Amino acid sequence: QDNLYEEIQKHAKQYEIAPQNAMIDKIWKATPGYNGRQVDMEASYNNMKKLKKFDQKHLEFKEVSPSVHLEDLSPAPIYRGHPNKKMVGLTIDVAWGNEYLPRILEILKKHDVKATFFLEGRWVKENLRFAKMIVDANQEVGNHSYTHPNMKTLSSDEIRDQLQKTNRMIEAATNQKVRWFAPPSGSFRDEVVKIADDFQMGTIMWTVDTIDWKRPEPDVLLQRVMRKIHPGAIVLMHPTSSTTEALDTMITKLKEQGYKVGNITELLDEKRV
Numbered sequence: 001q002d003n004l005y006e007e008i009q010k011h012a013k014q015y016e017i018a019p020q021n022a023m024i025d026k027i028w029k030a031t032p033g034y035n036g037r038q039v040d041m042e043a044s045y046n047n048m049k050k051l052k053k054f055d056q057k058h059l060e061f062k063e064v065s066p067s068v069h070l071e072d073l074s075p076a077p078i079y080r081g082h083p084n085k086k087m088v089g090l091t092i093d094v095a096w097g098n099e100y101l102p103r104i105l106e107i108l109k110k111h112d113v114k115a116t117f118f119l120e121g122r123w124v125k126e127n128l129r130f131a132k133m134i135v136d137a138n139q140e141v142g143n144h145s146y147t148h149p150n151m152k153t154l155s156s157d158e159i160r161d162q163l164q165k166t167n168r169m170i171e172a173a174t175n176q177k178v179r180w181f182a183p184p185s186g187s188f189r190d191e192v193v194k195i196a197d198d199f200q201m202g203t204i205m206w207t208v209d210t211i212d213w214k215r216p217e218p219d220v221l222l223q224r225v226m227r228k229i230h231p232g233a234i235v236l237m238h239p240t241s242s243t244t245e246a247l248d249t250m251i252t253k254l255k256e257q258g259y260k261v262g263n264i265t266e267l268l269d270e271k272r273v
Contacts, residue, residue: 033066081232089267095120097239114263121146121166142180
């Protein structure tokens with residue numbers, strides 16, 4: 001009946017996905033947009049013409065940008081990636097735990113996965129070689145304040161000083177520009193978010209807390225994560241024994257469920273997985 005080209009045409013709408021716009025969710029606050037897609041006729045045809053049969057596995061796509069982007073939103077915290085993006089973001093808050101950093105970095109290398117390392121400024125100052133170790137492993141770093149105060153109760157001057165001192169220390173020690181800020185203990189108010197934005201940083205929270213600082217059994221941590229994970233989840237960890245013992249299996253199980261796993265910059269990208 002139809003030739004292969006017509007069969008691909010007939011299936012094009014079935015695999016089309018509209019782009020999704022960024023918005024500020026009443027509950028989850030600032031959420032990125034996510035690319036849509038349409039069938040690339042030429043690449044799809046070229047992938048199927050040797051076997052002369054339609055195979056959806058061999059479709060290729062052109063992506064379609066949304067109209068409203070994360071950077072268009074008013075300042076607001078980011079808890080999650082887009083809920084249709086089959087990706088999980090890993091964040092690691094670092095103010096201690098040097099002895100676990102090399103193993104964590106090796107596990108990430110083994111899986112070719114990235115995590116955002118949010119660094120406390122005083123920790124960087126006192127542990128320059130470990131800060132360098134993280135970026136030498138090709139991992140991105142973010143701002144975790146300078147002394148881990150409760151930023152919700154700080155004056156605006158103190159918020160500005162905490163953020164600025166930390167960025168100066170991180171950028172001197174790693175030569176990387178800082179894009180992301182993680183509040184200590186997740187404690188913030190609107191003025192924290194606005195001042196972080198004045199330093200050109202988004203404020204990153206999470207949706208899945210490992211609570212690894214309580215030293216759970218590794219399997220208890222793994223099960224906690226798998227019970228709570230979802231598309232666009234951001235997972236909060238620290239350099240702990242629990243995280244280090246669970247991380248290899250955790251990434252394996254996430255990939256088995258169909259998730260891409262990456263850092264915050266990758267998670268919030270509009271590009272499709």
